[PDB]
Amino acid sequence: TCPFYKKIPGTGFTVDAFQYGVVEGCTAYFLTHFHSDHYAGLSKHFTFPVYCSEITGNLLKNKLHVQEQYIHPLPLDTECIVNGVKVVLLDANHCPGAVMILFYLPNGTVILHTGDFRADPSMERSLLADQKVHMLYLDTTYCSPEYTFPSQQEVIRFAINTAFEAVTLNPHALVVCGTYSIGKEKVFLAIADVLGSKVGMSQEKYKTLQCLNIPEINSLITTDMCSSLVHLLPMMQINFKGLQSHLKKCGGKYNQILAFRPTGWTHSNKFTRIADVIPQTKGNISIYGIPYSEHSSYLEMKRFVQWLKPQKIIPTVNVGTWKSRSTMEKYFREWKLEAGY
Ligand code: NI
């Protein structure tokens, strides 16, 4: 049964709730972004409207095969009427095509649903600036003060350096990057750009990337592995036994892999900086963890919530245990008392 934090009061609207069957009263199903925990349930056999971004729409048509008529894409930053309810989609700074949604209720209440988001000061000069938001459905993935991590630009710096160093020291080394969903494309696109290469990938990953409206994408990616010295592999596969296995397949064309595992937070964020990172080394294969996040740090979330001064906050992540729920409420009370809303 669909949980209350996936429903919008005073509408027939649900958000990211495609896994419960028909939800009684729901005229419209919103999908914030193409990540399987949020889309779990969609197929070619959906014949209810789905509202989403253009980019999410392309992924729905081409990867799950939903029929063009039931995909209502909407432009961002555009006041749009949807069953006689004004809504806006705003960029979430998550993965490609990921959105937050502003709902303007008839009764005068305004609600923001963040979907998954990495809060940023550029949001404070968006359409949110123009009016009061009463309710906030919030991505609470990293709602605890241990959760710090660097800026994406810091991380992309490190990567561009590591890769370009090794490639120049040894010109027969391959760069690999791990992936399992959309997101974090900047990692591999930045490395490939510094090395004068395209990125090489399986057919299915090429298909996924050809849906994202990246400008110039035909110049940046290929399915021809032989022709490329930055390769993408499944994240499952980014280990020694799998990198060894893969290093065979290239057929004596490279004598050393240098891989990157973009991850979110791990416990080594508590005791080590980004300029002071190392990889595990079994022979000639070197695997980097790099903490590239597409979710708000604790401080980033805090600033956004304290600027927004919402009258009420409804968590959408880590809501399954009473301890997590309770811990989160305590932070929301501190923020409000500090900020005087
Ligand atoms: Ni996500």
Coordinates of C-alpha atoms and ligand atoms in Angstrom, one line a residue:
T1 CA 0.0 0.0 0.0
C2 CA 1.4 3.4 -1.2
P3 CA 2.9 5.4 1.7
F4 CA 1.6 8.9 2.6
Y5 CA 5.0 10.5 1.8
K6 CA 4.4 9.4 -1.9
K7 CA 1.1 11.3 -2.1
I8 CA 0.4 15.0 -2.7
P9 CA -2.6 16.3 -0.6
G10 CA -5.6 17.8 -2.6
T11 CA -4.7 16.3 -6.0
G12 CA -4.9 13.0 -7.8
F13 CA -1.1 13.1 -8.0
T14 CA 1.5 10.5 -6.7
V15 CA 5.3 10.8 -6.8
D16 CA 7.6 7.9 -7.6
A17 CA 4.9 5.3 -6.7
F18 CA 4.9 2.8 -9.6
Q19 CA 5.3 -0.3 -7.6
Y20 CA 1.9 -0.7 -5.7
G21 CA -0.5 -1.4 -8.7
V22 CA -3.3 1.1 -9.2
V23 CA -3.4 3.7 -6.5
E24 CA -7.1 4.6 -6.1
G25 CA -7.8 8.3 -7.0
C26 CA -4.5 8.8 -8.7
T27 CA -5.1 10.5 -12.1
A28 CA -1.4 11.1 -12.6
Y29 CA 1.9 9.4 -11.8
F30 CA 5.0 11.7 -11.5
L31 CA 8.5 10.2 -11.9
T32 CA 11.4 12.4 -10.6
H33 CA 14.2 10.5 -12.4
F34 CA 15.3 7.2 -14.0
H35 CA 16.7 5.3 -11.0
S36 CA 15.2 1.8 -10.4
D37 CA 14.1 2.3 -6.8
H38 CA 12.0 5.2 -8.0
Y39 CA 10.7 3.6 -11.3
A40 CA 10.3 0.0 -10.0
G41 CA 7.1 -1.2 -11.6
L42 CA 6.8 0.7 -15.0
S43 CA 6.7 -1.4 -18.2
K44 CA 5.3 -1.2 -21.8
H45 CA 1.8 -1.9 -20.3
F46 CA 1.3 1.3 -18.3
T47 CA -1.7 3.2 -19.7
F48 CA -1.9 6.0 -17.1
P49 CA -0.3 9.3 -17.6
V50 CA 3.3 9.7 -16.5
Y51 CA 4.7 13.2 -16.2
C52 CA 8.4 13.6 -16.2
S53 CA 11.3 15.5 -17.9
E54 CA 12.1 15.1 -21.6
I55 CA 15.2 13.1 -20.7
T56 CA 13.3 10.8 -18.4
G57 CA 10.8 10.3 -21.1
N58 CA 13.4 9.2 -23.7
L59 CA 14.6 6.6 -21.1
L60 CA 11.0 5.4 -20.5
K61 CA 10.3 5.0 -24.3
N62 CA 13.7 3.4 -25.2
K63 CA 14.7 1.3 -22.0
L64 CA 11.4 0.1 -20.5
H65 CA 9.4 0.6 -23.8
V66 CA 6.5 2.7 -22.6
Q67 CA 4.2 4.1 -25.4
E68 CA 4.8 7.7 -26.5
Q69 CA 1.2 8.9 -25.7
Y70 CA 1.4 8.1 -22.0
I71 CA 4.7 9.8 -21.6
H72 CA 4.0 13.5 -20.9
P73 CA 7.4 15.2 -20.9
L74 CA 7.4 18.8 -19.6
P75 CA 10.0 21.5 -20.0
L76 CA 11.8 22.8 -17.0
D77 CA 11.4 26.3 -15.6
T78 CA 8.0 26.7 -17.2
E79 CA 4.7 27.3 -15.5
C80 CA 2.6 24.4 -16.7
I81 CA -1.0 23.4 -16.1
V82 CA -1.7 19.7 -15.3
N83 CA -5.3 18.7 -14.7
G84 CA -6.1 22.2 -13.6
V85 CA -3.1 22.3 -11.1
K86 CA -0.1 24.6 -11.8
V87 CA 3.2 22.7 -11.6
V88 CA 6.8 23.5 -12.3
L89 CA 9.7 21.1 -12.8
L90 CA 13.1 22.4 -11.6
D91 CA 16.6 20.9 -12.1
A92 CA 17.5 18.6 -9.1
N93 CA 21.3 18.5 -9.7
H94 CA 21.1 14.7 -9.3
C95 CA 21.5 12.5 -12.5
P96 CA 20.5 13.5 -16.1
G97 CA 16.8 14.3 -16.4
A98 CA 16.3 14.4 -12.6
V99 CA 13.8 17.0 -11.3
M100 CA 12.2 18.5 -8.3
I101 CA 8.5 19.4 -8.6
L102 CA 6.7 22.5 -7.4
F103 CA 2.9 22.0 -6.8
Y104 CA 0.5 25.0 -6.5
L105 CA -2.7 23.8 -4.8
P106 CA -6.1 25.5 -5.4
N107 CA -6.5 26.1 -1.6
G108 CA -3.2 28.2 -1.8
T109 CA -0.8 25.7 -0.3
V110 CA 2.5 25.3 -2.2
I111 CA 4.5 22.1 -1.9
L112 CA 8.1 21.2 -3.1
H113 CA 9.1 17.7 -3.7
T114 CA 12.9 17.4 -4.1
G115 CA 13.0 13.8 -5.5
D116 CA 16.7 13.0 -5.3
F117 CA 18.8 16.2 -5.2
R118 CA 22.1 17.8 -4.4
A119 CA 21.2 21.1 -2.9
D120 CA 23.1 24.1 -4.3
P121 CA 23.1 27.9 -3.9
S122 CA 22.0 28.3 -7.6
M123 CA 18.6 27.0 -6.5
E124 CA 18.1 30.1 -4.2
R125 CA 17.9 32.2 -7.5
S126 CA 15.4 30.0 -9.3
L127 CA 11.6 30.1 -9.4
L128 CA 11.5 29.0 -5.7
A129 CA 12.8 32.5 -4.8
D130 CA 9.5 34.1 -5.9
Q131 CA 7.1 32.5 -3.3
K132 CA 6.5 30.8 0.0
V133 CA 6.7 27.0 0.3
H134 CA 4.6 25.5 3.1
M135 CA 5.5 21.8 2.8
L136 CA 8.8 20.1 1.7
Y137 CA 9.1 16.4 0.8
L138 CA 12.9 16.1 1.4
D139 CA 15.7 13.7 0.2
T140 CA 17.2 12.8 3.5
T141 CA 19.8 10.3 2.2
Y142 CA 22.7 12.1 4.1
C143 CA 20.9 13.8 7.0
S144 CA 23.6 13.4 9.6
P145 CA 26.5 15.6 10.4
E146 CA 29.1 12.9 9.8
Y147 CA 28.2 13.1 6.1
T148 CA 30.7 15.4 4.6
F149 CA 32.2 15.0 1.1
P150 CA 34.1 17.3 -1.4
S151 CA 32.6 19.4 -4.3
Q152 CA 32.1 17.6 -7.7
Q153 CA 34.6 20.1 -9.2
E154 CA 37.2 19.0 -6.6
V155 CA 36.7 15.4 -7.4
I156 CA 36.8 16.0 -11.2
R157 CA 40.1 17.8 -10.7
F158 CA 41.7 14.8 -8.8
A159 CA 40.5 12.4 -11.5
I160 CA 41.7 14.4 -14.5
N161 CA 45.1 14.6 -12.8
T162 CA 45.5 10.9 -11.7
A163 CA 44.5 9.7 -15.2
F164 CA 46.5 12.1 -17.3
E165 CA 49.6 11.4 -15.1
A166 CA 49.6 7.7 -15.5
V167 CA 48.7 7.8 -19.2
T168 CA 51.7 10.1 -19.8
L169 CA 54.1 7.9 -17.6
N170 CA 52.9 4.7 -19.3
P171 CA 51.1 5.2 -22.7
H172 CA 50.0 1.5 -22.7
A173 CA 47.8 1.8 -19.6
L174 CA 44.0 1.7 -19.8
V175 CA 41.6 4.0 -17.8
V176 CA 38.4 2.1 -16.6
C177 CA 35.5 3.6 -14.8
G178 CA 32.7 1.7 -12.9
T179 CA 29.0 2.4 -13.5
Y180 CA 25.5 0.7 -12.7
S181 CA 22.9 3.4 -13.4
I182 CA 22.8 6.8 -14.9
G183 CA 24.6 9.6 -13.0
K184 CA 28.2 10.7 -12.6
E185 CA 28.8 10.9 -16.4
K186 CA 31.1 13.8 -15.8
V187 CA 33.8 11.4 -14.3
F188 CA 34.4 9.5 -17.5
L189 CA 33.7 12.3 -19.8
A190 CA 36.2 14.6 -18.1
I191 CA 38.9 11.8 -18.1
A192 CA 38.4 11.0 -21.8
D193 CA 38.5 14.7 -22.7
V194 CA 41.9 15.1 -21.1
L195 CA 43.3 12.0 -22.9
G196 CA 42.0 12.9 -26.4
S197 CA 39.8 9.7 -26.5
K198 CA 36.1 8.7 -26.8
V199 CA 34.7 6.5 -24.0
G200 CA 34.1 2.9 -25.0
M201 CA 31.2 0.9 -23.6
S202 CA 28.8 -2.0 -24.2
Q203 CA 25.9 -1.6 -26.6
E204 CA 23.3 -1.3 -23.8
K205 CA 25.3 1.5 -22.0
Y206 CA 25.8 3.3 -25.3
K207 CA 21.9 3.1 -25.8
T208 CA 21.3 4.5 -22.4
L209 CA 23.7 7.4 -23.0
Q210 CA 22.2 8.2 -26.4
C211 CA 18.9 9.1 -24.6
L212 CA 20.4 11.9 -22.4
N213 CA 20.5 15.0 -24.7
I214 CA 24.2 15.5 -24.1
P215 CA 25.5 18.0 -26.7
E216 CA 28.1 16.6 -29.1
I217 CA 27.6 13.1 -27.7
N218 CA 28.4 11.4 -31.0
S219 CA 32.0 12.8 -30.7
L220 CA 32.4 11.7 -27.1
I221 CA 31.4 8.0 -27.0
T222 CA 31.8 4.8 -29.0
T223 CA 30.9 1.0 -28.9
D224 CA 34.3 0.3 -30.5
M225 CA 36.4 -0.8 -27.5
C226 CA 39.7 -1.3 -29.4
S227 CA 39.7 2.3 -30.7
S228 CA 39.4 3.8 -27.1
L229 CA 41.5 4.2 -24.0
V230 CA 38.8 5.0 -21.5
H231 CA 36.5 2.0 -21.0
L232 CA 33.2 1.7 -18.9
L233 CA 32.4 -1.5 -17.1
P234 CA 29.7 -2.8 -14.7
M235 CA 30.4 -1.8 -11.1
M236 CA 30.1 -5.5 -10.1
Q237 CA 33.0 -6.1 -12.5
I238 CA 35.4 -3.4 -11.0
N239 CA 37.6 -5.8 -8.9
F240 CA 40.9 -7.7 -9.5
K241 CA 39.3 -11.1 -10.7
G242 CA 37.1 -9.1 -13.1
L243 CA 39.7 -6.5 -14.2
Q244 CA 42.2 -9.4 -14.8
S245 CA 39.5 -11.2 -16.8
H246 CA 38.8 -8.0 -18.8
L247 CA 42.5 -7.2 -19.2
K248 CA 42.8 -10.5 -21.1
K249 CA 40.0 -9.6 -23.6
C250 CA 41.8 -6.4 -24.8
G251 CA 44.3 -8.8 -26.5
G252 CA 47.8 -7.6 -25.5
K253 CA 46.9 -3.9 -26.2
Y254 CA 47.5 -2.5 -22.6
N255 CA 49.8 -3.5 -19.8
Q256 CA 48.1 -1.7 -16.9
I257 CA 44.6 -0.7 -15.9
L258 CA 43.9 2.4 -13.8
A259 CA 40.3 2.3 -12.6
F260 CA 38.0 4.7 -10.7
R261 CA 35.1 3.6 -8.5
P262 CA 32.9 6.7 -8.0
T263 CA 31.0 6.0 -4.8
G264 CA 29.0 8.1 -2.4
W265 CA 30.0 8.3 1.3
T266 CA 32.0 5.6 2.9
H267 CA 33.5 5.5 6.4
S268 CA 37.0 6.6 5.0
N269 CA 35.4 10.1 4.5
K270 CA 35.7 10.6 8.3
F271 CA 39.6 10.4 8.4
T272 CA 41.1 11.1 4.9
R273 CA 40.9 14.1 2.4
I274 CA 40.5 14.0 -1.4
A275 CA 44.1 15.2 -2.2
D276 CA 45.3 12.3 0.1
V277 CA 43.6 9.3 -1.7
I278 CA 45.2 5.9 -2.5
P279 CA 44.1 2.7 -4.4
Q280 CA 44.2 -1.0 -3.6
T281 CA 47.0 -2.7 -5.7
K282 CA 47.1 -6.4 -6.7
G283 CA 49.9 -6.4 -9.4
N284 CA 49.4 -4.1 -12.3
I285 CA 45.7 -3.2 -11.6
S286 CA 45.0 -0.1 -9.4
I287 CA 41.4 0.7 -8.2
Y288 CA 40.5 4.2 -6.8
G289 CA 37.5 5.0 -4.7
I290 CA 36.5 8.6 -5.4
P291 CA 33.6 10.1 -3.4
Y292 CA 31.6 11.8 -6.2
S293 CA 28.1 12.4 -4.7
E294 CA 24.9 13.3 -6.4
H295 CA 23.1 13.8 -3.0
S296 CA 23.3 16.7 -0.6
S297 CA 25.9 16.7 2.1
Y298 CA 24.6 17.5 5.6
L299 CA 25.7 21.1 5.4
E300 CA 24.3 21.6 1.9
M301 CA 20.9 20.2 2.9
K302 CA 20.9 22.4 6.1
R303 CA 21.6 25.6 4.1
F304 CA 18.8 24.8 1.6
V305 CA 16.2 24.0 4.3
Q306 CA 17.2 27.1 6.4
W307 CA 16.8 29.4 3.3
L308 CA 13.5 27.8 2.3
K309 CA 12.0 28.1 5.9
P310 CA 9.3 25.4 5.1
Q311 CA 6.4 25.2 7.6
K312 CA 6.5 21.4 7.4
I313 CA 9.2 18.8 6.3
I314 CA 8.3 15.2 5.2
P315 CA 11.4 12.8 4.8
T316 CA 11.4 10.5 1.8
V317 CA 14.7 8.6 2.6
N318 CA 15.6 6.5 5.7
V319 CA 12.0 6.5 6.9
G320 CA 11.8 2.8 7.5
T321 CA 13.0 2.7 11.2
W322 CA 11.7 4.7 14.2
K323 CA 15.3 5.5 15.2
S324 CA 16.1 7.1 11.9
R325 CA 12.8 9.0 11.9
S326 CA 13.5 10.3 15.4
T327 CA 17.1 11.3 14.7
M328 CA 16.0 13.3 11.6
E329 CA 13.3 15.3 13.6
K330 CA 15.9 16.4 16.1
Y331 CA 18.0 18.0 13.3
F332 CA 14.9 19.7 11.7
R333 CA 14.1 21.2 15.2
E334 CA 17.7 22.6 15.6
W335 CA 17.7 24.1 12.1
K336 CA 14.4 25.9 12.8
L337 CA 15.5 27.1 16.2
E338 CA 18.8 28.4 14.8
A339 CA 17.1 30.1 11.9
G340 CA 14.1 31.5 13.8
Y341 CA 11.3 30.2 11.5
Ligands
NI1 NI 18.6 8.6 -7.3

